[PDB]
Amino acid sequence: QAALAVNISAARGLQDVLRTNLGPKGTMKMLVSGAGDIKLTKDGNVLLHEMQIQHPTASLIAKVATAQDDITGDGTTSNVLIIGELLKQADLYISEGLHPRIITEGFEAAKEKALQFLEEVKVSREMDRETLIDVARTSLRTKVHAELADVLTEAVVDSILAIKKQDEPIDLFMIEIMEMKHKSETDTSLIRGLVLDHGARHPDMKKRVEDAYILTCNVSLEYEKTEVNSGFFYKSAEEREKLVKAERKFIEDRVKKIIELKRKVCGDSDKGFVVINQKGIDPFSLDALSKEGIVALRRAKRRNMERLTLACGGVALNSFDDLSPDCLGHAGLVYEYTLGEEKFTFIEKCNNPRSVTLLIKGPNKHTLTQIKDAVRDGLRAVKNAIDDGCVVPGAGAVEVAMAEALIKHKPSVKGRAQLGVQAFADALLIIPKVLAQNSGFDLQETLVKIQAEHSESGQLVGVDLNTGEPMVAAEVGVWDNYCVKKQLLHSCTVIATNILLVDEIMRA
Amino acid sequence: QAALAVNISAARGLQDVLRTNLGPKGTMKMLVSGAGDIKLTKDGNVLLHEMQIQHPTASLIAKVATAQDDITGDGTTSNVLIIGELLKQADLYISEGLHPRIITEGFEAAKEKALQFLEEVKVSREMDRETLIDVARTSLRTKVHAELADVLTEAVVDSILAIKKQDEPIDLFMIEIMEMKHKSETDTSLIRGLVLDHGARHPDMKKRVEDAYILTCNVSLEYEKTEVNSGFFYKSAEEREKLVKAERKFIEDRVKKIIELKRKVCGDSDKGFVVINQKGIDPFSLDALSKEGIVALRRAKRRNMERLTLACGGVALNSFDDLSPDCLGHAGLVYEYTLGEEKFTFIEKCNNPRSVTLLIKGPNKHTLTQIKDAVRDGLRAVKNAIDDGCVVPGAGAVEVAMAEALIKHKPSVKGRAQLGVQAFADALLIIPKVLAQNSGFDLQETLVKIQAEHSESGQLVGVDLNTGEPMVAAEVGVWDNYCVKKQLLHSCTVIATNILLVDEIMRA
Amino acid sequence: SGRKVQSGNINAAKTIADIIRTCLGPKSMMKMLLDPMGGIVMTNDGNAILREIQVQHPAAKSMIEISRTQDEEVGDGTTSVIILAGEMLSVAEHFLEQQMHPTVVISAYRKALDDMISTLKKISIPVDISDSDMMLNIINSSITTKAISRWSSLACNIALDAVKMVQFEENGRKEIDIKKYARVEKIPGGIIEDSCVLRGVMINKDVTHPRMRRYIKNPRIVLLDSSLEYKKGIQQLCEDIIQLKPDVVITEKGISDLAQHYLMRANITAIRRVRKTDNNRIARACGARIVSRPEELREDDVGTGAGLLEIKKIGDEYFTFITDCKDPKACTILLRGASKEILSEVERNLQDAMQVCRNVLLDPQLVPGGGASEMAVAHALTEKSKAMTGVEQWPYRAVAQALEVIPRTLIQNCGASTIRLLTSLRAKHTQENCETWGVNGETGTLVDMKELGIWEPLAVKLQTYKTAVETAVLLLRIDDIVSGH
Ligand SMILES: Nc1ncnc2c1ncn2[C@@H]1O[C@H](COP(=O)(O)OP(=O)(O)O)[C@@H](O)[C@H]1O
Numbered sequence A, B: 001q002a003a004l005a006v007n008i009s010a011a012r013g014l015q016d017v018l019r020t021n022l023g024p025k026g027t028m029k030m031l032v033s034g035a036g037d038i039k040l041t042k043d044g045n046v047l048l049h050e051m052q053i054q055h056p057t058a059s060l061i062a063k064v065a066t067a068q069d070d071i072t073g074d075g076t077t078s079n080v081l082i083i084g085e086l087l088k089q090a091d092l093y094i095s096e097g098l099h100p101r102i103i104t105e106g107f108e109a110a111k112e113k114a115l116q117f118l119e120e121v122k123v124s125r126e127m128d129r130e131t132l133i134d135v136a137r138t139s140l141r142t143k144v145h146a147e148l149a150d151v152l153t154e155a156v157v158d159s160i161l162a163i164k165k166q167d168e169p170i171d172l173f174m175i176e177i178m179e180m181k182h183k184s185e186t187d188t189s190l191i192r193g194l195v196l197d198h199g200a201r202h203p204d205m206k207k208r209v210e211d212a213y214i215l216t217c218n219v220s221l222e223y224e225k226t227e228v229n230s231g232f233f234y235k236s237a238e239e240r241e242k243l244v245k246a247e248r249k250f251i252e253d254r255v256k257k258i259i260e261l262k263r264k265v266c267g268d269s270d271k272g273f274v275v276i277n278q279k280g281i282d283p284f285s286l287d288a289l290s291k292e293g294i295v296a297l298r299r300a301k302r303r304n305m306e307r308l309t310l311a312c313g314g315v316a317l318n319s320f321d322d323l324s325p326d327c328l329g330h331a332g333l334v335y336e337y338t339l340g341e342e343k344f345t346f347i348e349k350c351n352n353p354r355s356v357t358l359l360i361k362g363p364n365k366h367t368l369t370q371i372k373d374a375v376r377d378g379l380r381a382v383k384n385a386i387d388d389g390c391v392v393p394g395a396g397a398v399e400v401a402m403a404e405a406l407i408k409h410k411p412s413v414k415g416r417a418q419l420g421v422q423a424f425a426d427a428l429l430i431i432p433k434v435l436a437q438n439s440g441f442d443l444q445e446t447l448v449k450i451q452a453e454h455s456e457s458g459q460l461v462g463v464d465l466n467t468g469e470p471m472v473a474a475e476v477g478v479w480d481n482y483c484v485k486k487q488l489l490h491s492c493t494v495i496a497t498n499i500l501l502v503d504e505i506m507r508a
Numbered sequence C: 001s002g003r004k005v006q007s008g009n010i011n012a013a014k015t016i017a018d019i020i021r022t023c024l025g026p027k028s029m030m031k032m033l034l035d036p037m038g039g040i041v042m043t044n045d046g047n048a049i050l051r052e053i054q055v056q057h058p059a060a061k062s063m064i065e066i067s068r069t070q071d072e073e074v075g076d077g078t079t080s081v082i083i084l085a086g087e088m089l090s091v092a093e094h095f096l097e098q099q100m101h102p103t104v105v106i107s108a109y110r111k112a113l114d115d116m117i118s119t120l121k122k123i124s125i126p127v128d129i130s131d132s133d134m135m136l137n138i139i140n141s142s143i144t145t146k147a148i149s150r151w152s153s154l155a156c157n158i159a160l161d162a163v164k165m166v167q168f169e170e171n172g173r174k175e176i177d178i179k180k181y182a183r184v185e186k187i188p189g190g191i192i193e194d195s196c197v198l199r200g201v202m203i204n205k206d207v208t209h210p211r212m213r214r215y216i217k218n219p220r221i222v223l224l225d226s227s228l229e230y231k232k233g234i235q236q237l238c239e240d241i242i243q244l245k246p247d248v249v250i251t252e253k254g255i256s257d258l259a260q261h262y263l264m265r266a267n268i269t270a271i272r273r274v275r276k277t278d279n280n281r282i283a284r285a286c287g288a289r290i291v292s293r294p295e296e297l298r299e300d301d302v303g304t305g306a307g308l309l310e311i312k313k314i315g316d317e318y319f320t321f322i323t324d325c326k327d328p329k330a331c332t333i334l335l336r337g338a339s340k341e342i343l344s345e346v347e348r349n350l351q352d353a354m355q356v357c358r359n360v361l362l363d364p365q366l367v368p369g370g371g372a373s374e375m376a377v378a379h380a381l382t383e384k385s386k387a388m389t390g391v392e393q394w395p396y397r398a399v400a401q402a403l404e405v406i407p408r409t410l411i412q413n414c415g416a417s418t419i420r421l422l423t424s425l426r427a428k429h430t431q432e433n434c435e436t437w438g439v440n441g442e443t444g445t446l447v448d449m450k451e452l453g454i455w456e457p458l459a460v461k462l463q464t465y466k467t468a469v470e471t472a473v474l475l476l477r478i479d480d481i482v483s484g485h
């Protein structure tokens, strides 16, 4: 009747696996696929998809943890560690009978006390560039190489500052990252306005164009007066010559419209009307548009036109027959960058001072994958910081204070829920201990020093991962997200209670 | 590394074996000999002495525990339980580093604090009958049936109160326990004086001797003849058959010397001449001296003779003469008792009333032995209580108060010794838990109730081992010995430290 | 074998009862489902536990089936039924090993069941009908401890209005109630407050082109299973329909625009792609008739139904409103929200309260929950068995001593000791005559249930006890399983 032992053992095993990953000094994990592809990562959000999990309840914990941390994206490893420690602390008392339901009551009471205590240790300030820089640094050093994260911090914080319209949170589309394969990492710069993935490699593309416009093109050289794109009807003689003429006049009858529009907007494309096409265009049409300053481009992506529609103004719809000059998409400046082999289009000064993009760049996928998910985590963390007005100290400083508050609140609760809150407060201390252990310092000595410092002085002191000393965690600038901590408590308590409440595992 | 784990497991196993004996409600254990003899008992000393322990280090723990318990009164099972819980608590932290020296320093600091606290907790209540009744009840209900213990309390307390008149610590020699197998066990009381093991084959010498004089001197009515000549009745048979004679003349000379002593110091045929011999005496001279009023007896061990010397007086030697009456002693009543087939010599109302024996009439051998050991333990407990003149509350009480003192004293100490202090406190928690468990109640529920009641009361509170609710031991009447607690703390700390300090097991 | 098969049947019963014995009460423990792929399921409901698990013994299958049939008939209490049946079949082990026949055990069980029915009907507290006060009290008692605590303010009045929409007055006073005829309208979107009630059938299907006289001030519905074609060269059926002159004729086939004009020539409105679960409730609420045989065609082919028809396209979708129906026995209830994950549960608990209400119309009685009723009837039986003699007195007493499993498990899955609490509960339940106390499910402490405020419908308790006793007697009546393996 004791399947709780099996569940606890599997949870502890998962804790052991996901340990040694916290802080900037965490050890990376080595994800190898079955085919032979390799992957290096440290964050639990992607690590809890590590091909094989073996134990089924460990898979359950992974599934629920991922599904619930998809809303904050920073408490995964901490969630797993605190779950494992809660289960172990509960087991020390379940071993001597003590039905787990009252343990669950104690856990819930301790959670309420901890949530109450969190509301007064959070510091709310008119956060500025330096504070977001510190937040991004804390969120980045813990997911990528220490030195490398320093350059990405600036490109993240300035991008978020530009994107921040008002109290409304940011949007996922409103910041986009780009992939490219330069030999050297060459930092990562911030580009105002949308960046196009691909372009045509005609020699006469206009580089410096100001106050340009744009329209999307779907099908222009396949079928005459028909939007369908498919195989050619060679058998039908009337259709065969119609599609041959579709090569020339099907594009000319609207290139004339494009050139007359660009002329009546600015003499002989004085402002340089630009065009974009879903696919390739006629080589003669390409030459004509290059000579007319129209810059024909191909290989348009499905995520480009809808992003630039509200960014470049008008509506750059795929279909032809522009007709009314309202759908044309204004572009203050457009550039063509062809670093190494691939060429890129930089759409700047569009009808939006927002919707910027990043420029992550480096060696083959084994590194740029880390770059991209690390910068994504940094962006999400700084987005949480921009959403709330309060931030909390890190380095486990908040949790030592939480454990102290719960211990002092323990005699208030009657019954064995007293013992439950004792176990919860004891288990909350895992993060400082793991942080101290991962840096090579003594696990218990550092915790004892931190507890003594927080007892003698009310400052929320934390662990310093370069000397193993109690550090204030406020002046140093190691702040953590408030919402992340709240969701961490909410997730850990519910998962621990649910696992503690099971019995009689059955083979369905 | 692993020897420590082996020792932890063995100590935990021994604790689990001995767990269900602590407290008056504990369940007894049955010791069956290899021959087939059965012994049923619960006293910690005899269990550790007679158990067939398998684990070597468990045998070591038992040996040192009984060796140290031989000093003080008792408290062995509590000591073993505390050692086991100390080891488990220490291992709980040693599993995560914590070189055992740190735990040892914590243990010694906690021991110092606990000794101090016990100094401020002791009760210096004076001498009276009722408190010693309560002490005897406490020491006896933990060893034997409740009603039988209530019967024995009066006899034990009265015997010790009588011996107390010297105003010096005295016991053991001066109180003796006699063994006999009467069917009715209810007959149990004090016999002021001395009871001899057995008498002799004599037809109605005196019965009620009343006032008489004692000289002993191992009368030689069956004086050692010259039987030993050469091996056995060889061809020279006239030696061992005729030379064996001429010694009856020595017997008759001793008879006339006894006659001279009797009608020299007695002044008449009355005033019985009490003499005892270590070997047999012929019935002929026995009755010849009996007709003269001489109280002749034979076949007694040494211990009764040295007891008579310090109580009545008299030299002891098989071959003697008409010595001086200086060693002669007098007794008020030398009444001889007989029950069915065995005869008892009640040497009562003698000089030096310090010598007192106790009467027990158990039906079978094992009940007799159990009553004897329970009486011995009660006598030792009352002796200790009188000697120190201070008693402490039982039923836990002191354990939980020392735990609170240690816990509040934990931040005072520096370094990682706080871990050792906490382990020591949680180890001292074992006694009230074991009492509650053996009663039939819940461990943590009763412990929480006791601690909560102690929180705002301050006064010592213990477990009521019939309902489980907290009770103040002073009012109810449960008392412990201060010296027992001192020895308990010292021995448990010493043995736990010695077990913790080991690191390797090797054969020899 | 002989009694070996009886022992096997009741052993299967016991080993299937204790699987879900722990998952009742307000503090039910969770269960683990390990499918042979690796997946794992959190579960509190024992019904899903039994549904997902696979069994091989016919006795276990029969008991699972009876638990189901109780589930979709009366609603809740399946775990209690399984637990009680397992307990009685387990306590029958002692007597089946006394070499004493199952028939006398069966007779003792039947007598015990009759006495338990009597003592429940004696101990039940009355409740008022058509009064919102103790209706809301019952809502607090049973309709709570569900996912409705956040939406009880709407569930309560939805049910309280819904109580008077499915009545049949056949043989007595509103004692007949049918279950599926309530026009459920579950549609996500908008706020949950948009959920309301309407007296009439709500049909989600509509004519493709409603350019005709759809609504008439006295719908005389005629049902027909025939298919409407172009014309005779079938207008002949329409011509025969003209004979009785109706205004609405309901079919189950598509209608064309020219077919629409041919129908409105007769001024009759047809419908298409409708469901039988809609047609039956339409006929029930309208009292119409379906007939197409010319010989049987008489003046009875037209039955007047509603009195007002309306069509509203709320959110560009084709609704059809049929209000003021002749028979208010199939009427509209509306459901609104975002997701159907909870509104379905709230609905089902509301019709559970509906069944509560109809039984209150039959027996307006409530039994004290939290083990109060169980211990009360156990005391009634134990004091009753003193007077009665015979060899069957032992099973009669054992049934009583077995039915106290519900408070025992309520205490067990709360932390508190199940021995001391049960002894104390019995002590304050025998000599204390007029109390009928119970055990708190939350804190595991004895409390008078008149003060805590938990009660159960009489009918559900009666059905649970009767089904448990019948299951026990059925499993004791099976003397051979063998027809093969
Ligand atoms: N410079 C630093 N000093 C101290 N602690 C740090 C530092 N950087 C990160 N941390 C710690 O790392 C933890 C967050 O990392 P983690 O929770 O492992 O991210 P994820 O769960 O997304 O993998 C925080 O608790 C924070 O205290």
Ligand SMILES: Nc1ncnc2c1ncn2[C@@H]1O[C@H](COP(=O)(O)OP(=O)(O)O)[C@@H](O)[C@H]1O
Residues within 6 Å of the ligand: B021, B022, B023, B024, B043, B044, B073, B074, B075, B076, B077, B078, B138, B141, B142, B377, B393, B394, B395, B396, B435, B463, B464, B465, B478, B480
């Ligand atoms: N009446 C009582 N109620 C509660 N506890 C008691 C009672 N009598 C004795 N005890 C407890 O029993 C313990 C002694 O039991 P035990 O260890 O068997 O004696 P010893 O080992 O000294 O022979 C004491 O610590 C005392 O607190």
Ligand SMILES: Nc1ncnc2c1ncn2[C@@H]1O[C@H](COP(=O)(O)OP(=O)(O)O)[C@@H](O)[C@H]1O
Residues within 6 Å of the ligand: C023, C024, C025, C026, C076, C077, C078, C079, C080, C145, C369, C370, C371, C406, C410, C439, C440, C441, C442, C454
């Ligand atoms: N708050 C409560 N306190 C005590 N007992 C309760 C409480 N709520 C429900 N119960 C008990 O739960 C039992 C029914 O629950 P259960 O049968 O598990 O639900 P279902 O009938 O849906 O299976 C009843 O006997 C009732 O006494």
